[PDB]
């Protein structure tokens, strides 16, 4: 797994590979790891499939009820807090590395990391999952303050393609989502649409 999300002025971009593994067998080649928690709040899931599905379903329930009670769209920070409380309290029994990203009217586009152990931190951009090791350098050299939506989508797709080339545990297609006040726009990059960088064969 490789997951990623990036803030822009007015929203967020989220991305993931699509591979589920047991050992080195690919049990699902087209997994959807970006899961909607509310209208404009998604989580990106890494670690245990069972654990992250259970936790996402529970938070969806908690956040949905909270939202009806308040009669308002939920804050992204509230979604992140609910993930954090559950990931922290059950940290000994879960294997879950999460990114929460979305939009709300109060604070705009926001990205939160909830890594294993259940800490929470807001970031400009976040990466996670085992494949993320291989793109720290890339994201650190390539990130620029003030990127547009279209630039965040390219940045994300490029980072994920690189991780997927190197990490046996990541692959398949790239799923992307952009979230803003106007809604959610999802797309898939597959085959020839995935950014491509040569293998450096010998001169």
């Amino acid at each position: 797994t490789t997951i990623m999300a990036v803030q822009f002025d007015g929203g967020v971009v989220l991305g993931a590979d699509s591979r589920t593994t047991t050992g080195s067998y690919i049990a699902n080649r087209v997994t959807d790891k970006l899961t909607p928690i509310h209208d404009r709040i998604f989580c990106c899931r890494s670690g245990s499939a069972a654990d992250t599905q259970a936790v996402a379903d529970a938070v969806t329930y908690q956040l949905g009820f909270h939202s009806i009670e308040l009669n308002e769209p939920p804050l992204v920070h509230t979604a992140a807090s609910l993930f954090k409380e559950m990931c922290y309290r059950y940290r000994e029994d879960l294997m879950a590395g999460i990114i929460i990203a979305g939009w709300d009217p109060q604070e705009g586009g926001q990205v939160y990391s909830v890594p294993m152990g259940g800490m929470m931190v807001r970031q400009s951009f976040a990466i996670g999952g085992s494949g993320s090791s291989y793109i720290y350098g890339y994201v650190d050299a390539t990130y620029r303050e003030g990127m547009t939506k279209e630039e965040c989508l390219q940045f994300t797709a490029n980072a994920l393609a690189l991780a997927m080339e190197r990490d046996g545990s990541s692959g398949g297609v790239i799923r992307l989502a952009a979230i803003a006040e106007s809604g959610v726009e999802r797309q898939v990059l597959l085959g020839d649409q995935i950014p491509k960088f040569a293998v450096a064969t010998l001169p």
Binding site: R91, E92, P115, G117, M119, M120, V121
Partner: protein, 216 residues
């Protein structure tokens, strides 16, 4: 926590005439990976008291949540009594000991600094409930690399000015950055005086690499 995940390294503290200064870098490491490079490991508890934490950052956030709610609860009463630095340190000792005694520690080592009634307070609490006070403290590799320098200065001159304590802390942060492979050259300094608690940062030490050309 049985197994720490994202962790912070050393926290330093030193008493000076009129206050206490503490220092901690802004890094959360994930094993050797310098993963979260802009996190604060220092808390303003109330006007007289501050806290810095080494160890598991999620456990630090939990303490911050609990202790933040306790000061709020107390402020609601508006009754002229506030938790002194010493009372906060006592509470922390009990909480860590209690969690140790359930075989489910909070995986942290903490430095509490304060100023109340004309007295500087500096106290240590670890994950087993070991607690004490001293004129200077250093957790983690700081205990080996910084504390010898702090104590040597304090023997020649037990009473330091604010500016002397601040320069001494900066020298220690430099040594730690040279010698601790989980450190990072971006830190905060927090100070408590009569006027309250101030947190400054992000700060960096200058470094010298002349020895790189002396392979001797």
């Amino acid at each position: 926590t049985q197994n720490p995940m994202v962790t912070g390294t050393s926290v330093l503290g030193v008493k000076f005439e009129g206050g206490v200064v503490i220092a901690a870098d802004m890094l959360g490491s994930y094993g050797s990976l310098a993963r979260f490079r802009n996190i604060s490991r220092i808390m303003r508890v109330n006007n007289s008291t501050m806290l810095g934490a080494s160890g598991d950052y999620a456990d630090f956030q939990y303490l911050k949540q609990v202790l933040g709610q306790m000061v709020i609860d107390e402020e609601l009463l508006g009754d002229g009594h506030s938790y002194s630095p010493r009372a906060i340190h006592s509470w922390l000792t009990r909480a860590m000991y209690s969690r140790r005694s359930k075989m489910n520690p909070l995986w942290n080592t903490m430095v509490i600094g304060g100023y109340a009634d004309g007295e500087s307070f500096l106290g240590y609490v670890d994950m087993l409930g070991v607690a004490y006070e001293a004129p200077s403290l250093a957790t983690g590799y700081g205990a080996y690399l910084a504390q010898p320098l702090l104590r040597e200065v304090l023997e020649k001159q037990p009473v330091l000015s604010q500016t002397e304590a601040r320069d001494l802390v900066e020298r220690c942060m430099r040594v730690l950055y040279y010698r601790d492979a989980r450190s990072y050259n971006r830190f905060q300094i927090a100070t408590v005086t009569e006027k309250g608690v101030e947190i400054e940062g992000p700060l960096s030490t200058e470094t010298n690499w002349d020895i790189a050309h002396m392979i001797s």
